[PDB]
Amino acid sequence: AQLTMIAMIGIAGPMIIFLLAVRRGNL
Amino acid sequence: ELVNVVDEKLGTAYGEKIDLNNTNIAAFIQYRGLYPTLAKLIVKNAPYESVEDVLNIPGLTERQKQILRENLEHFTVTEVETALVEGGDRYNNGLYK
Amino acid sequence: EKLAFYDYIGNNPAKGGLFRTGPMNKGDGIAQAWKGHAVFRNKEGEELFVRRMPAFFESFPVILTDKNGVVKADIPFRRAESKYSFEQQGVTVSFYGGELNGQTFTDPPTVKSYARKAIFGEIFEFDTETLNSDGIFRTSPRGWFTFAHAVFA
Amino acid sequence: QTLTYDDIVGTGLANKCPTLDDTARGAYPIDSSQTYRIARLCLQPTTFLVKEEPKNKRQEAEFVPTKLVTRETTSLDQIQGELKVNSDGSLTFVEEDGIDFQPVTVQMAGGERIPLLFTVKNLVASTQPNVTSITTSTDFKGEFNVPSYRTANFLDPKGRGLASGYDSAIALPQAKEEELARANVKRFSLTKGQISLNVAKVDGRTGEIAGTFESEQLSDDDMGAHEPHEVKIQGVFYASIEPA
Amino acid sequence: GFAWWAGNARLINLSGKLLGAHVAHAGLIVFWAGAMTLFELAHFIPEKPMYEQGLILIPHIATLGWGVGPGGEVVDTFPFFVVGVVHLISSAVLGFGGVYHAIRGPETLEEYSSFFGYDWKDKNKMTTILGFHLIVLGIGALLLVAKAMFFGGLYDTWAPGGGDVRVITNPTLDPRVIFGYLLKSPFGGEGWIVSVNNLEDVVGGHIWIGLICIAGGIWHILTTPFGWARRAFIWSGEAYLSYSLGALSMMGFIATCFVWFNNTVYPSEFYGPTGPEASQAQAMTFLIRDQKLGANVGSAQGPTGLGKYLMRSPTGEIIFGGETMRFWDFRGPWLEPLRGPNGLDLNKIKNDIQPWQERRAAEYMTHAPLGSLNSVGGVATEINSVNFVSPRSWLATSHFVLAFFFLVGHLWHAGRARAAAAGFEKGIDRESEPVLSMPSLD
Amino acid sequence: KLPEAYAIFDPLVDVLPVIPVLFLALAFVWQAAVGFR
Amino acid sequence: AELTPEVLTVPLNSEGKTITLTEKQYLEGKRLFQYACASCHVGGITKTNPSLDLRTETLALATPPRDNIEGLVDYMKNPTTYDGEQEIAEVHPSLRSADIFPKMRNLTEKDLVAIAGHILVEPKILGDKWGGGKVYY
Amino acid sequence: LNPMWRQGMFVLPFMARLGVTGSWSGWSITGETGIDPGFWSFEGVALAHIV
Amino acid sequence: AIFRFLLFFQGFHNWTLNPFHMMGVAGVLGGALLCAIHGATVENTLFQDGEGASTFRAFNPTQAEETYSMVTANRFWSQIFGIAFSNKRWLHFFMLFVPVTGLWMSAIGVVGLALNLRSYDFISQEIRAAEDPEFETFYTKNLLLNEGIRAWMAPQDQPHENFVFPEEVLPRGNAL
Amino acid sequence: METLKITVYIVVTFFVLLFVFGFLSGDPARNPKRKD
């Protein structure tokens, strides 16, 4: 759906923050 | 002595029929075949002394005279009223919807 | 006449204004006599009824109805497409009781003139010269008392 | 050379009638076995004179000068009509159509605004007999109609009007109406005016003429609310004649 | 010492991270232009006028002469696709450089290279950066010239035959015309640069602007500010930002009026009629209708005494009557055939109105730029039915709003830049309160 | 409409222009993660 | 109240034969009327010529009567003035003039029937509001 | 029949006495219409005294 | 529905002409003015009590000292506007006084409107306008608007009255 | 009227030049703290 794409796209942003926070990145 | 001439006109045949000398051109839409073509000629060739005069409009086809003949009973003529025909008001009297 | 005078909107206390000062007589005048009860009929002899002015309205159109509430005559604003004019409908007025008892009027501007007054209820003759009345409704002592005491409260 | 819109716009030249060179002292001959029309009549007022009221008896006031306050909106132009040759050789111009009216308001001394419908509507103007040629001494004299300055739909500031509006002073519900009848009942006036046109220039080649005019007519009466004033209008004119 | 909500101010003295901020932000601008174009194209239907479809970027490309033929009919949508894809692709490159310089790159440029590093206080370096960008801008103005003269031309709503794409072979160079515009009054009937009404003047202005920017760019690379300029300005990063904010604000106000009044570089074929245009077309429409019925529209006196259809302007020109008397300065290609030297020509009006002019008037009158926020077309009392708000209203309102806030942003940063350069932007020193060492007022 | 060959990506294109808005919102998730320092 | 077959029944021709539209046809005709007609004919008036409206009694008195599906479908192909004397395809959208009125190009014969049907149905639902103007808003 | 002294005018005659005779609205006390007095009209004199 | 109530009061009570409403308006707009100008003044006469660029952190709710200079604020406004506050207690009382008093005044006018005791007309204007059809003011123009409001909304807004106004009785200007 | 026009052109030009030269006359330096 259109809502499938915008869900995947929308998930990307916060996923970056999470990966960096769970790995103690330079946040 | 101070009388509204438009209100007075509503007390004559003008208030019940299409007055060939006075009525705005939009009223010819009430009967079929009259608008816009015959309405245009009728208004351009006013005034008329008798309702029957409109049959003598130069240029009428026989079908147009037939339409007029059939609608003569919905026509009337009263004296021209300056207030109703000045301002080009028979073509556009400021009334839309 | 006393009962008819109660049936007249000029004595309604909710028809005044804050800065319209003085007695009610200063507005519509000193009432002199009941003119009689106006009965309106169209050209078909149907009795018509003037729609009365509600207290909310500073001004109100003149609309005449039959016993069933159907509009049968009015005073039109735009004349060009009027269907219900007094002229077209042959509206007349007849008076019973009071000063004009048994008189009938047929000339449209006179008939309209009484129709304009009938929206106020029963029709009265007023003396407007003695107090130089201005023709604009004022409220009664019932109105002024209520206003002052609700504001003080 | 010819001027375009973009040369004229905003200059005031659009309100001016075409002029003829001071050499144009020719004569335009009139063939009676021929019909003629005025292809364009242009009238440009230069002076508005209003007659005063002397209040008293047989003194009769004069025409006083006035100031125009409505700007360069005054000229009649694009007027056309038949130019007829009569049995006696007089010519008669019959106005057919054109921009033949302009509302104008001028101010008299003291501040009174006088509005008027400057017009030549339905103008019929004739010459003297035996013209045979239009020359720098030909005069046209005629009369025209002056309809009401406002037409039937116009509503006064309390909503009263002739073909529309209230028929009473609704803000004074119980005032006696007889004092108000002149303001409550609108009427539509239709009066006559008079105009002289004096041909002072003639281009015999092209059929253009130019000259001077004086007209007299009534000002606005505000649909019967007040008495009109008499107005005298002077200006210049231009006209072009064609074989019809 | 800045809080999180002023966190981008921490970037003031970190030239490397600020570069990434800027380049990343530039990627965002390019992304929207690419994404919006494709979105518009995906929704585009060629049989509907563009202004019935909420399009603002496709009209900009069509105006450059791509995709359209005579009358503004869209002939080929592929150029639209190309413009969108190429912008879209390019944003990934800008994004890439942007986050590299912001996260991984050198925090400050001045140690890595003396060419790219800068101090805000270095007046010589600042004018050189300025100079480089002036040359870029000058080149950009010349690309528009190149498109108009050497690469197919531009759409020309004034072209004879209903508008068409036209190559510009004689751009206006006369500086009395070009700079003449800059000195016209901004009031009605004049309209400053917004009155530019032909592509020759448009193309010629960009030749002039291109050269002036390149010349000024070389000027500022080669010079340093003169002392009168040194003593007049505040020399700091926030001062510079404040100056640009004011310039952008002024520019937004101009663009607002441009899209609202100009029907040359915003052709009404693509953007819909202007407000003046649509109001003139209503008077035209009923002129035409009534005249067909037998009315003599020249001699018709209206209720006020003025002409019902035709009257004079304050300077005598014959114009349309009614409330549209205010819009007589309007000029448009469907109307100009009816003008003579004195304004509208009664003989042309009686005899020479064409069907395509009747159509275009009726179309423009029924697409006047009035509509509700939820896109119900027409006056505020209209019922639901027509889904329509003019692109001109959308473009005018959005850019008035943006221009206003940027003026506020100018005031904010200009005042702070002044106060920070004088050293009291954080408050008054209790031990050295200036007012306490002044004499009393009374 | 998009050219035929790309019609598969039509629903993706209907969504793309919103993406810059997500960068502003993403800035506040980032600040939420580090506690608005 | 609901959309019943009775309200969805409209005259097909002058002879008095009738046709019953589906609800689907009605909603489609409404959408197409908005797409191609409403900019001038919203609510059954005519913005560029208010003297002529889409009321049934008005269409009945047109020459060719237009108060039936056939008369309306014909009008959309070859519109004439109210008295039938002049063809007006050049200033009124129609199939005959779809080159200059591009929204008419992609309309099929069944679309014309749906547009015609909506125009005949709507006064049955809205009464005086259809074609009445702002007075009845 | 209605000169200033019939109208209770008191300072008007002192302006008229020394030469101020017209008003910016175009009338003069001598009865002549269409006159321009320039600044020193009755209005200008009044204004001058206020300033 | 409250928007409807606003427009009803214009059309039927001419409420904008009421001096008790006007005093209410001055109290609400005067309140909002006072709110903005006092907040801005404090924030722009702050003392430097910390080193950060965020000045909020340099305040402590138990500190004895004023956090901004009344003296500099007073001189600014005296030279900009001519007058200024000099008394902090009076200033904050006045901030109480203005919007409270404004709202009390509008309440009094609505008590009057409970009885239709409106400030609807000016009698002198109506007398002149009735007799002189060339006399027009913004006062008479607004009453024409009220009259339109009444006739056009009353049937649908007061459905229990069963008002039937035929098209011919509706007040309308030309064309519209 | 032209006398009026010229007079106003002159008066407006004067006040504008005061404004411009006034701010060009070392205005950053006219403050109570650091004048440079």
Ligand code: CLA
């Ligand atoms: C409860 C008190 C009360 C009431 C209800 C009345 C009622 C009446 N009186 Mg009587 N009267 C009273 C007290 C009262 N009076 C007193 C105390 C006096 C002596 C002054 C009089 C003297 C008097 C005379 C001499 C006359 C009347 C007359 C009348 C009648 C007409 C009233 C009128 O035009 O109002 C007009 C009222 C107003 C225009 C309202 C004014 C109120 C203003 C607008 C309020 C000001 C608000 C203020 C500024 C708020 C700002 C505060 C802010 C700073 C915080 C009416 C029956 C008249 C009559 O018909 O007699 C036969 C008459 O001639 N009265």
Ligand code: CLA
């Ligand atoms: C080119 C434009 C530009 C640039 C580069 C800057 C740069 C800067 N500004 Mg300035 N500013 C600008 C325009 C600009 N401003 C404009 C136009 C205004 C007026 C509105 C301001 C008003 C302003 C103030 C009041 C302040 C700054 C400050 C600052 C600094 C820190 C800002 C920060 O971290 O924001 C952090 C960003 C945010 C907190 C996000 C704000 C969110 C906005 C307001 C709402 C967005 C709504 C949007 C339209 C729709 C949202 C849809 C929804 C679905 C999300 C920085 C140096 C600060 C300063 O002085 O530093 C020295 C400061 O206090 N600016």
Ligand code: CLA
């Ligand atoms: C256009 C908007 C914009 C841009 C470009 C920037 C850019 C920047 N900010 Mg600002 N900021 C913004 C809006 C913006 N900000 C707003 C709205 C706020 C209010 C919340 C702030 C508040 C703020 C604070 C409080 C601070 C900054 C700081 C910074 C800088 C360092 C950030 C950092 O270390 O991230 C580290 C974060 C991460 C590593 C998490 C992931 C971030 C990546 C970039 C997300 C990319 C996602 C994207 C889909 C990737 C596409 C890749 C593709 C190209 C292949 C950087 C230059 C900091 C600074 O100045 O440092 C001294 C700082 O302290 N900003």
Ligand code: CLA
């Ligand atoms: C205005 C934007 C801008 C600016 C000022 C800089 C400046 C800098 N970058 Mg950055 N960068 C940018 C954009 C920018 N970059 C972009 C868009 C990308 C993504 C491709 C990068 C990716 C990037 C990387 C990966 C690195 C740098 C590095 C550097 C530094 C050294 C560069 C060097 O030696 O020159 C090299 C010069 C050239 C290669 C000349 C080629 C000219 C280019 C390619 C074409 C001209 C562009 C044209 C005018 C416009 C674009 C066309 C388009 C419109 C179609 C320098 C401080 C380096 C650094 O900091 O190391 C510590 C480094 O490693 N940059």
Ligand code: CLA
């Ligand atoms: C982005 C564009 C830009 C920017 C920011 C600058 C910035 C600067 N320039 Mg450069 N300049 C540029 C483009 C630019 N320039 C171009 C393209 C050229 C070539 C024409 C020049 C030629 C140039 C010269 C010859 C000089 C500068 C100088 C300067 C400095 C002083 C500026 C100043 O006081 O102006 C403030 C403006 C004034 C004091 C006068 C205002 C006059 C305008 C026209 C008034 C009009 C205002 C009105 C409201 C708007 C209508 C416009 C009207 C013409 C119709 C400053 C660093 C000076 C310097 O130090 O250089 C070393 C200097 O002498 N510049």
Ligand code: HEC
């Ligand atoms: C403005 C550009 C219009 C659009 C879009 C549509 N119509 Fe129209 N219509 C318009 C005018 C100016 C007129 C009067 C034409 C004349 O001179 O007679 C009409 C008329 C009609 C009629 C006749 C109504 C009658 O009472 O006889 C019909 C049935 C009609 N129009 C239908 C119609 C349809 C179905 C449209 C969308 C396909 C449509 N019109 C669009 C102006 C405009």
Ligand SMILES: CC1=C(/C=C/C(C)=C/C=C/C(C)=C/C=C/C=C(C)/C=C/C=C(C)/C=C/C2=C(C)CCCC2(C)C)C(C)(C)CCC1
């Ligand atoms: C083009 C393209 C692409 C790209 C994309 C991108 C670029 C993306 C991005 C993305 C992003 C960029 C995202 C982001 C997102 C985010 C979000 C999702 C956010 C959220 C938020 C929130 C929700 C918030 C909340 C909060 C907080 C946190 C705090 C405060 C409060 C609040 C509540 C506000 C791809 C690859 C697909 C491919 C295809 C095409």
Ligand SMILES: CC1=C(/C=C/C(C)=C/C=C/C(C)=C/C=C/C=C(C)/C=C/C=C(C)/C=C/C2=C(C)CCCC2(C)C)C(C)(C)CCC1
């Ligand atoms: C720094 C920072 C920031 C910012 C960031 C930014 C702003 C960035 C940007 C980025 C970017 C700016 C990105 C971009 C990207 C893009 C891309 C990735 C693209 C892709 C593309 C594609 C892949 C396409 C495809 C296609 C085609 C080709 C065709 C058509 C179809 C389609 C569309 C599918 C923030 C705030 C967050 C935080 C802090 C830090």
Ligand SMILES: CC1=C(/C=C/C(C)=C/C=C/C(C)=C/C=C/C=C(C)/C=C/C=C(C)/C=C/C2=C(C)CCCC2(C)C)C(C)(C)CCC1
């Ligand atoms: C392209 C084009 C064109 C052209 C254009 C041009 C040529 C332009 C120019 C422009 C210009 C040429 C501009 C200029 C501007 C300027 C300005 C805007 C200024 C500014 C100023 C200021 C800001 C200042 C300030 C100050 C002062 C006053 C004092 C001291 C201090 C200071 C310095 C701060 C045309 C139109 C033809 C057409 C179309 C296109």
Ligand SMILES: [Fe+2]
């Ligand atoms: Fe406080």
